Amino acid sequence: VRHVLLRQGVLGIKVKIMLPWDPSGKIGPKKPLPDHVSIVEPKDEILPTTPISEQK
Amino acid sequence: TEQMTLRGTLKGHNGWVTQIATTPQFPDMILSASRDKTIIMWKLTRDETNYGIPQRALRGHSHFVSDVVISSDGQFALSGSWDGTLRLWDLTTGTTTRRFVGHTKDVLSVAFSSDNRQIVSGSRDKTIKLWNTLGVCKYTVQDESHSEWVSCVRFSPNSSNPIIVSCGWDKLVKVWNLANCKLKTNHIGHTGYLNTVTVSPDGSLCASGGKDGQAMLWDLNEGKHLYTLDGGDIINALCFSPNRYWLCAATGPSIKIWDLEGKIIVDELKQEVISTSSKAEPPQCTSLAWSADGQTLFAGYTDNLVRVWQVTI
Structure with a gap:
């Protein structure tokens, strides 16, 4: 918040800025997203199995 | 045919019976674990007033007690629990x-050796671990290990064989050799992912x-795929028998008791009907264990x- 003067009256400034970091980087900010808290889900799920024994 | x-039914829990194991020193007792955070040590009778009454309930864990196992001595007992810790009881x-x-x-999972100096554990830490019976870590296995949770471990007969079984959710069975790891x-x-594994008392299977x-x-x-059977949609417990060469398979609605010589189903245990809507008539069977006699x-x-059955000839 900043007051700035002029010859006739005063003007009020307000500045609000939203920080970008959330999971990766800094790490600093915590996980909860703005106003819809979201889950991030990796992918993989397959099989290739058939009978075999690998003797070591 | 057999x-x-x-036979009958026991009552004492407020939660799901997770595992049962049997003292061979006393077939008079039998031990159970459950999802109401207690292990019940029973006092059995063959009576009709009851088939048994709970003697005591060992307490301390802050979560469910998954698996329980007897000592060779039968005067100690060991536990694995969903609190991330184990306890070593004086039964x-x-x-x-x-x-x-x-x-x-x-x-x-947890198990107690014949030598009574080695104790293993399966954990969602993704670690098999070896344990002194002074409760300190003889070794810990975390390299060449499963990349998914370790489901169940077993001790195998140490006739001359230094082998312990491990199975995980990574669709593999790993065998580990003692003191080389x-x-x-x-x-x-x-x-599918593996729930359980168990070894024959004779030690060949x-x-x-x-x-x-x-x-x-x-x-x-040496690790060979002997054979396969179609059956056991979801397999939760397995148990060899001492008085016969059977194998008893725990499916959810039913138990399938199999003779393997030759491969055939002996019987299917079904519980009596109960009228439900939409459908909630089966309760899942999760564990099973033979008595020393092998009749019950x-x-x-x-x-x-805990439902009881008996073999009749």
């Missing part, structure tokens, strides 16, 4: 001998299972009961 009659009144601190997450072998052959749907058999002596077996169900 068939099964419904008389209570009074923990030792509590074992390790593992980041739960202790699913290397992979003896890796066995592949389960579409490994009955393994999972959500494969098929129950595949492996060889304890007990079963753990999720209706909070």
Whole structure:
């Protein structure tokens, strides 16, 4: 918040800025997203199995 | 032919019976664990007033007690619990001998050796671990290990064989050799993830299972896929028999008791009907264990009961 003067009256400034970091980087900010808290889900799920024994 | 009659039913829990194990020193007792955070040591009778009454309930864990196992002596007892820790009981009144601190997450499986100096554990830490009976870590296995949770571990007869079984949710069965801690072998052959594994008392077999749907058999002596049977949609417990060469398979609605010589189903245990809507008539069977006699077996169900059956000739 900043007051700035002029010859006739005063003007009020307000500045609000939203920080970008959330999971990766800094790490600093915590996980909860703005106003819809979201889950991030990796992918993989397959099989290739058939009978075999690998003797070591 | 031989068939099964419904013997009776025990009552004492407020939660699902998770595992049962049997003292061979006393067939008079029998031990149980459950999802209401107690292990019940029973006092059995063969009476009709009851088939048994709970003697005591050992307490201390802050979560469910998954698995329980007897000592060779039968005067100690060991536990694995969903609190991430283990306890080592002095099976008389209570009074923990030792509590074992390790593992980041739960202790699913646990077992107690013949030599009574080696104790293993499967954990969602993704670690098999070896344990002194002073409750300190003889070794910890975390390299060449499963990349998914370790489901169940087993001790195998140490006739001359230094082998311990491991099975995870990574669709593999790893065999580990004592005091070298290397992979003896890796066995592949389960579409679904593996729940359990167990070894014959004679020591030549490994009955393994999972959500494969098929129950595949492996060889304890070098690792060979002996044979397979179609049955056991979800496999939760397996148990060889001492008085016969059977194998008893725990499916959810039913138990399938199989003779393997030759491969055939002996019987299917079905519980009597109860009218439900839409459908909630089966309670899941999750555990089973034979008695020393091998006439009677007990079963753990999720209706909070331990159902008894008996073989009749």
